[PDB]
Design a protein around this nucleic acid. Structure first.
Lengths: 75, 112, 100, 67, 55, 19, 141, 142, 185, 144
RNA sequence: ACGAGACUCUGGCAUGCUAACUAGUUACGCGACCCCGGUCGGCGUAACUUCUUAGAGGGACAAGUGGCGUUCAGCCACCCGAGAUUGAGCAAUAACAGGUCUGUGAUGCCCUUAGAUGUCCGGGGCUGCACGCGCGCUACACUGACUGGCUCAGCGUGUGCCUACCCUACGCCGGCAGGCGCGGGUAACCCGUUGAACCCCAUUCGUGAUGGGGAUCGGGGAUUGCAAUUAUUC
């Protein structure tokens, strides 16, 4: 009935709003980045290995099916 | 037929003592009384009588087929005790089932 | 001098009647014979249809045919094996031996 | 499910009628009584007999039983 | 030749070469344990051969 | 035996000799 | 003081695959670009240098179980022949492609044939197995 | 000093495993591989229950190996769990006191009865007229 | 360590089963808190043997439904181990005290049964039984044909039911399960 | 890197086909009737072409490199077991046949068997099943 | 009194017992690698029968208490314990005009019986296809699919009198199917430590009839057979 139109690589604002507002959430899973920041699950995965490399997010537990990242803590 | 060498195989013949309990010796005892011309009641009560004469616990003699008429009839003759279920009916009964070509049809002989 | 009894029988305690007589019947001449090794049983499994024709509820047979194997090794000259094994038999057990 | 049949309850009412002196409260003692004072052709049925024997035997410690 | 034509069919294989060793029909044949025996005749002589229903 | 039949064919094929 | 069995077996083939970028004389075959690794597979093996991973895995299956051959490598590399519309069966791996690891690990002195047939693993190779276990047994630190 | 051979099994399904206790220090492993990487790792802590309820003081001077064969994966995990727990009790029978052999036994019964008492639940035999035991094929009328 | 049984890495203590009504049939306090939910089993023999089953193993067993998933408990212990990360890293409370708050809000306290169908109350075990069904159903529906995974929807519905915010599937079903029961009382 | 590059191709037009520019290039080319999921990998395996790239990323003059391997499979080192029209009926050549040609090859095949009045050609003309199915109960919705 | 039950086989328990170079375990010499000490289905031969094997008995009984009950038959709960209802086989009286003459050298009768309803051989047919029902297989995905690696089975089968056609380790040639050389086995010896799948963990995908589904059809290569088009199978 409805057909979603997700983005495959970043537009100018979608990299800006990912590079800022991904750690400004509390959960970071590549299913909610695909939902909220309007991209595909593969990009949502590919856009978080480079934010773990940056020092903005933090990994909790890894699995083949689902990985759960979070904000970098207050401490 | 089985190809045994000449001098290996040999047959002996032993009479069955207390031959009444042997139901395959009684299935033939009921068979070759009829095809000569003894009646269905007369022969069967008498062979059932002989296995009661033999000193058996109990028995059941069923003769099924063309018992006079074009439609098939079955006459069941039971006196004494007879188990049916469980393990012991492997070694407490001798179940013989025989054919007989009477000149009108084929009769079953369930000596039990 | 290294002899080996092959005890293959269908009935269970029929095989006991022979594998009792292969120790109690052998020790009377003073030979240190080996014990009867329990080889694993074989259930020959057949499931046929009870019905001769193909009408009725699909009711199946389960004709199991268990076979029981033992071996007893012999510390014996084979002249004495012709003595014991040619005496006291019943048709249940097939009396076979591996030679050396 | 565990209802004693007439072949259990009749061995229970003849063993106590004859061999009351030999029986007791304990199952395992009068389990073994039933081997000497009866010819029971089953391992299981002996325990079925000796079980309800001890039930009736705990009742004859009290008062009169019917059969 | 009629000798060439009367038995020209190979019986090397198939379910028309082997038969029941009592009935001589080519159906319900137990090839297991070299019985070559139709399922009905097997059921008849089960007790006689050595087989028995327990399970 | 030379062709040496098995003990699953002993009690079955010698069982046929009883039949 | 370590062996291969003490350490995680999943990332131990990841160690020997990274190691079999270096030695560089397994003498890999020519069909490796296009090949379907067993008949029950559909697509290309994603790992473009997969042969260094299934040289890594074969090097420790032959360590764990000695006297194992090519048709045994087809058993340890079995999956599902998802037979389209019929029910799926257990399809083996492939003889040829597994025989090329046993002319690649045998090219380099790592494996060796044993008596009455079957590949074992030579004590020179046994060291080269156990020494890279120590490299992962301190990679955990 | 004489030999102290303790060879005690555990069963949850057809999967069997005999846990072997001797003297040494607490290194426990399974066909030569330690307990910390028995795949699946999801049920890791199901193997540390006779470790974490008891401590490394009862695995202070006992070295254990667990030889495993038969059955499945979860069936083995519980058959090694039960065996190392049973072997720990049956190391403490024949060589140390009863009121410590009885003590640890009483603690693991308070956790899960399966740590010592095996489950006789096995694969029920298939019947004709169905794909398994308690399931028949679909009946049609009309 | 024998002081407390760390549920994977979660503490047994400070899981107050708030509802006196659903106290004994919710089993985690001090004895019924095992390390991993995957127990031996044997909690289907007697009528009320199943109420001794730990509430996480109850929720573990009720996830593996619809044929393809039947006999994949390992697969859905992992669903629970990943979903319990999503609960704490949103809420900031012990995920099991939040899990307990879910069933206490989710359990339909009355039902309708056909003696038109008459209004009836339920068993204090029935609310534990029916709630664990309801928010295994909503977690399954929402994530079917969806990028949002099972662990997220299972952690959403456990949070959404514990809140009682009416965007929960289990609450909206109870909101009509008890509405139909009010119609005929 | 993770952003869309310049002069991006949301849409391609290779061999009268609309190749949508958002798939993996191992799967982007599958729209062309003659190259499947399996074939499009091995074409991009023949040169060092990163197939983690999406269907609008890769070099605009190197999409010619993708074409020439598909049109000439043999010359770019592909064995003869990996081709569809192996040993042609007319010219006896081993060619991987793409979009427009695969219709021509099928059309010439169905019209060949039609013309010689072979039984295979007959059940194509009749709109039946040809690969020896049981047509009694199945093969319904096509024929009323 | 038969039937039900008891029973028979089967499942769970015997750290007791008889026995286990075709099952092993433990120790030991020994070979190897790992930096005082482990790993090894690496070989070799003193204890042992826990583990495997299958014999002899044994245990389990509502026996044990707490309650319900005429306080009897029993039932509910807990203790105790491997078991507190394992699963099936056998199966009464009296029947059905139930199915089978196409299981039978079971057969009464009815025809047939050289210009054959006997019989044998080649070909076709059983599959033929507007439709309707029945049992099922594969799915409609992201609890997934793919491609990697990782880790466990339990039943059985196997070289046939005629009868040819056995199960297959290995050594090679081949993308696969498959072919060709070589040894093992009539079996607890050999396949096989049955390295089964699901499953596990790590890659790829991202809601799109898609990377789900594999129907339909074309092209080629082999296999078994005297031969495959009416696609034998792969």
């Amino acid at each position: 009935r409805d057909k979603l139109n997700n983005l495959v690589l970043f537009d100018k604002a979608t990299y800006d709003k990912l590079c800022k507002e991904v750690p400004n959430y509390k959960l970071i899973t590549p299913a909610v980045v695909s939902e909220r920041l309007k991209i595909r699950g593969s990009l949502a995965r590919a856009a978080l290995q480079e934010l773990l490399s940056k020092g903005l997010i933090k990994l909790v537990s890894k699995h083949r099916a689902q990985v759960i990242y979070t904000r970098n803590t207050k401490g | 037929r089985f190809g045994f060498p000449e001098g290996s195989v040999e047959l002996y013949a032993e009479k069955v003592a207390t031959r009444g309990l042997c139901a395959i010796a009684q299935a033939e005892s009921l068979r070759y009384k009829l095809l000569g011309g003894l009646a269905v009641r007369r022969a069967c009560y008498g062979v059932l009588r002989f296995i009661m004469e033999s000193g058996a616990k109990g028995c059941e003699v069923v003769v099924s087929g063309k018992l006079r008429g074009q439609r098939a009839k079955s006459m069941k003759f039971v006196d004494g005790l007879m188990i049916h279920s469980g393990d012991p009916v492997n070694y407490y009964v001798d179940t013989a089932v025989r054919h007989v070509l009477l000149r009108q049809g084929v009769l079953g002989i369930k000596v039990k | 001098h290294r002899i080996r009894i092959t005890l293959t029988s269908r009935n269970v305690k029929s095989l006991e009647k022979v594998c009792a007589d292969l120790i109690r019947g052998a020790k009377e001449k003073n030979l240190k014979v080996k014990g009867p090794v329990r080889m694993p049983t074989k259930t020959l499994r057949i499931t046929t249809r009870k019905t001769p024709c193909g009408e009725g509820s699909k009711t199946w047979d389960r004709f199991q045919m268990r076979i029981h194997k033992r071996l007893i090794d012999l510390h014996s000259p084979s002249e004495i094996v012709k003595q014991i094994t040619s005496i006291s038999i019943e048709p249940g057990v097939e009396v076979e031996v591996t030679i050396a | 499910g565990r209802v004693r049949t007439k072949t259990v309850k009749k061995a229970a009412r003849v063993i106590i009628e004859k061999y009351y002196t030999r029986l007791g409260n304990d199952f395992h003692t009068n389990k073994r009584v039933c081997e000497e004072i009866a010819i029971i052709p089953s391992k299981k049925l002996r325990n079925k007999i000796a079980g309800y024997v001890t039930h009736l035997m705990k009742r004859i410690q009290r008062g009169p039983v019917r059969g | 030749g009629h000798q060439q034509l009367y038995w020209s069919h190979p019986r090397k294989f198939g379910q028309g070469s082997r038969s029941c060793r009592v009935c001589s029909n080519r159906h319900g044949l137990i090839r297991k344990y070299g019985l070559n025996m139709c399922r009905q005749c097997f059921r008849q002589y089960a007790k006689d051969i050595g087989f028995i229903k327990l399970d | 035996m030379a062709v040496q039949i098995s003990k699953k064919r002993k009690f079955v094929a010698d069982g046929i000799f009883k039949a | 003081g370590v062996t291969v069995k003490d350490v995680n077996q999943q990332e131990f083939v990841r160690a020997l695959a990274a190691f079999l970028k270096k030695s560089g004389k397994l003498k890999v075959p020519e069909w490796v670009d296009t090949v379907k690794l067993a008949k029950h597979k559909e697509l290309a093996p994603y790992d473009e240098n997969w042969f260094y991973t299934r040289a890594a895995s074969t090097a420790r299956h032959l360590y764990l179980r000695g006297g194992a051959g090519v048709g045994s490598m087809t058993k340890i590399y079995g999956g599902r022949q998802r037979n389209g519309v019929m029910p799926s069966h257990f399809s083996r791996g492939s003889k040829s492609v597994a025989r090329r690891v046993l002319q690649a690990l045998e090219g380099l002195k790592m494996v060796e044939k044993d008596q009455d047939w079957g590949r074992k693993l030579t004590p020179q190779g046994q060291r080269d197995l156990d020494r890279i276990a120590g490299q992962v047994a301190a990679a955990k630190k | 000093g004489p030999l102290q051979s303790v060879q005690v099994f555990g069963r949850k399904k057809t999967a069997t495993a005999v846990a072997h206790c001797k003297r040494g220090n607490g290194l426990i492993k399974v066909n030569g591989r330690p307990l910390e990487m028995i795949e699946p790792r999801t049920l890791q802590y199901k193997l540390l229950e006779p470790v974490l309820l008891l401590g490394k003081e009862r695995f202070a001077g006992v070295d254990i190996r667990v030889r495993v064969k038969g059955g499945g994966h979860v069936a083995q995990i519980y058959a090694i769990r039960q065996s190392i727990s049973k072997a720990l009790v049956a190391y403490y029978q024949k060589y140390v006191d009863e009121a410590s052999k009885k003590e640890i036994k009483d603690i693991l019964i308070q956790y899960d009865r399966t740590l010592l008492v095996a489950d006789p639940r096995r694969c029920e035999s298939k019947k004709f007229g169905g794909p398994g035991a308690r399931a028949r094929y679909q009946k049609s009328y009309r | 360590t024998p002081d407390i049984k760390l549920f994977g890495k979660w503490s047994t203590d400070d899981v107050q089963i708030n509802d006196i009504s659903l106290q004994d049939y919710i089993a985690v306090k001090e004895k019924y808190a095992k390390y991993l939910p995957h127990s031996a089993g044997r909690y289907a023999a007697k009528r009320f043997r199943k109420a001794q089953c730990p509430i996480v193993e109850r929720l573990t067993n009720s996830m593996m439904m619809h044929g393809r998933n039947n006999g994949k408990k390992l697969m859905t212990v992992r669903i629970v181990k990943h979903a319990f990360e999503i609960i704490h890293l949103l809420t900031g409370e012990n995920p099991l005290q939040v899990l307990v708050n879910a069933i206490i809000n989710s359990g339909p306290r009355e039902d309708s049964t056909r003696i038109r169908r008459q209004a009836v109350d339920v068993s204090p075990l029935r609310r534990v039984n029916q709630a664990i069904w309801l928010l295994c159903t909503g977690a399954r529906e929402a994530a079917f044909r969806n990028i949002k995974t099972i662990a997220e929807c299972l952690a959403d519905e456990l949070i959404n039911a514990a809140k009682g915010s009416s965007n929960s599937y289990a609450i909206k079903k109870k909101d009509e399960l008890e509405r139909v029961a009010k119609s005929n009382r | 890197s993770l952003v869309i590059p310049e002069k991006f191709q949301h849409i391609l037009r290779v061999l009268n086909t609309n190749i949508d520019g958002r798939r993996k290039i191992a799967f982007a080319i599958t729209a062309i009737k003659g190259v499947g999921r399996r074939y499009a990998h091995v074409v991009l395996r023949k040169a060092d072409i990163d197939l983690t790239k999406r269907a609008g990323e890769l070099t605009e003059d190197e999409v010619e490199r993708v074409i020439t391997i598909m049109q000439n499979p043999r010359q770019y080192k592909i064995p003869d077991w990996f081709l569809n029209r192996q040993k042609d009926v007319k010219d006896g050549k081993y060619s991987q046949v793409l979009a427009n040609g695969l219709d021509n090859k099928l059309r010439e095949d169905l019209e060949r068997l039609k013309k010689i009045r072979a039984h295979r050609g007959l059940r194509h003309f009749w709109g039946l099943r040809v690969r020896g199915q049981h047509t009694k109960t199945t093969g319904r919705r096509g024929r009323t």
